[PDB]
Amino acid sequence: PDFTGARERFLAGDVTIVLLIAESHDAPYRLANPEDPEADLSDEQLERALAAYLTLVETLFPELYAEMKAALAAAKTPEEKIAVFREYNARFLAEFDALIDQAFARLKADSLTLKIHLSQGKGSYEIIFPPEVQADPERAAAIEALWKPTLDQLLAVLQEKHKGKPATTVTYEISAETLRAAVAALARAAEAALRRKVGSLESSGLE
Amino acid sequence: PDFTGARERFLAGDVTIVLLIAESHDAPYRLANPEDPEADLSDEQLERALAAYLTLVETLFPELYAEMKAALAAAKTPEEKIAVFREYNARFLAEFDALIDQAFARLKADSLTLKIHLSQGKGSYEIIFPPEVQADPERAAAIEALWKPTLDQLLAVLQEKHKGKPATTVTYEISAETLRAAVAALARAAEAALRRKV
Numbered sequence: 301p302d303f304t305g306a307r308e309r310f311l312a313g314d315v316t317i318v319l320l321i322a323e324s325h326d327a328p329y330r331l332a333n334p335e336d337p338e339a340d341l342s343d344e345q346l347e348r349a350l351a352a353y354l355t356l357v358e359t360l361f362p363e364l365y366a367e368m369k370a371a372l373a374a375a376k377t378p379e380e381k382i383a384v385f386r387e388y389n390a391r392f393l394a395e396f397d398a399l400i401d402q403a404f405a406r407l408k409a410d411s412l413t414l415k416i417h418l419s420q421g422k423g424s425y426e427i428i429f430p431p432e433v434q435a436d437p438e439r440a441a442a443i444e445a446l447w448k449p450t451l452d453q454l455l456a457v458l459q460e461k462h463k464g465k466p467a468t469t470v471t472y473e474i475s476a477e478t479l480r481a482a483v484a485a486l487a488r489a490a491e492a493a494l495r496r497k498v499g500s501l502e503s504s505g506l507e
Numbered sequence: 508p509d510f511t512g513a514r515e516r517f518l519a520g521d522v523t524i525v526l527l528i529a530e531s532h533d534a535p536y537r538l539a540n541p542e543d544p545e546a547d548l549s550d551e552q553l554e555r556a557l558a559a560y561l562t563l564v565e566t567l568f569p570e571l572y573a574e575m576k577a578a579l580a581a582a583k584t585p586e587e588k589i590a591v592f593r594e595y596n597a598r599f600l601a602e603f604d605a606l607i608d609q610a611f612a613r614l615k616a617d618s619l620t621l622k623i624h625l626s627q628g629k630g631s632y633e634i635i636f637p638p639e640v641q642a643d644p645e646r647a648a649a650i651e652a653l654w655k656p657t658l659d660q661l662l663a664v665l666q667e668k669h670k671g672k673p674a675t676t677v678t679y680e681i682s683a684e685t686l687r688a689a690v691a692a693l694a695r696a697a698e699a700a701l702r703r704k705v
Contacts, residue, residue, distance in 0.1 A: 333570070335569060335570055386515075386518075386519065387519060387613070387649075389512075389515060389519070390512070390515050390516040390518070390519030390520075390521060390653055391519075391652060391653055393510075393511045393512030393515055393516050394511075394516055394521070394653060394655070394656035394657070395656065396511050396512075397510055397511050397656050398656055398659075400511070476509070477509065480509065480510070480511040481511075483511055483512075484511050484512040484515075487512055487515065488515070
């Protein structure tokens with residue numbers, strides 16, 4: 301997958317860039333209790349969410365991520381490193397509050413539904429617009445154009461994930477709220493993965 | 508008023524989230540006799556308090572909030588409704604006590620002052636630091652960075668509230684003391700509203 305220009309696509313309304321990173325990592329984000337991710341995910345799933353989260357924060361907050369990477373190098377105790385991480389995690393969540401609202405204001409559509417269809421051969425995608433965008437085909441075209449490169453990358457990723465499997469239909473309900481909820485979930489899981497690594501004989505990491 | 512990760516940010520020190528909820532409901536919280544909130548507010552402000560309070564419990568303790576919503580629904584006599592409320596209210600006040608302790612452990616500043624300045628046009632804010640953190644520009648910048656997003660939303664809310672008004676300056680005294688007292692004020696007012704409603 302390719303992430304050149306992710307932030308600008310995201311700001312312009314390509315909120316779906318987010319999904320790509322998650323799926324390019326097979327991360328969990330739509331949890332039953334996205335307040336105890338530790339309660340439901342194996343070491344592998346937690347690490348996978350951690351991977352997707354770290355890629356995403358590098359992509360949306362490169363200066364912030366750079367800053368945290370610096371402090372993290374400076375720290376020496378694994379305790380100092382987890383505390384550094386938690387400190388910048390809250391920063392990331394705040395900045396994301398700003399970026400989400402900006403993106404959706406540019407979309408001029410409060411919610412969309414994205415359906416990915418996977419079968420034996422090539423899949424398809426279907427963007428379900430609300431009545432305000434049903435009544436405005438110009439925007440509808442703009443949204444479709446904006447998402448198309450990343451949406452195609454996403455279909456490829458999902459199809460390689462379901463090789464030789466029965467016909468599956470994924471529905472993503474895309475709104476400001478849901479994007480915020482997913483990012484909070486990956487963040488919780490990322491910290492959980494980190495705490496597990498530090499308490500162990502894997503107390504070393506650079507992720 | 509919608510966040511990502513409000514709990515995590517609050518634990519990291521973003522106590523200003525609390526103020527946000529309050530103002531975005533125009534809830535009353537610095538009361539004269541905060542032992543008889545019924546005595547000092549009409550039905551409408553008490554309702555604003557109950558609204559803002561429930562927002563707070565859902566935002567910082569979503570699991571607590573769900574548990575209590577279920578229990579309160581299951582109760583059928585209004586007396587039992589008040590009782591479910593009092594129980595989960597004491598649980599919430601405890602959980603918040605712990606939340607405040609960690610928040611301020613990350614702040615490392617035993618009290619702060621926040622000034623919101625509103626004018627004909629756009630406002631500003633100024634965080635008055637205590638002297639040890641005034642002498643600590645790294646701590647200062649970090650607190651300001653973490654708080655800034657919430658501060659911007661709050662300024663927006665206040666600016667819409669003081670539209671077309673003469674230059675006004677709001678000051679918030681922010682400490683574990685003051686936060687605990689405000690949320691307790693909300694709890695008693697919320698119960699008063701509930702006692703009315705059921």
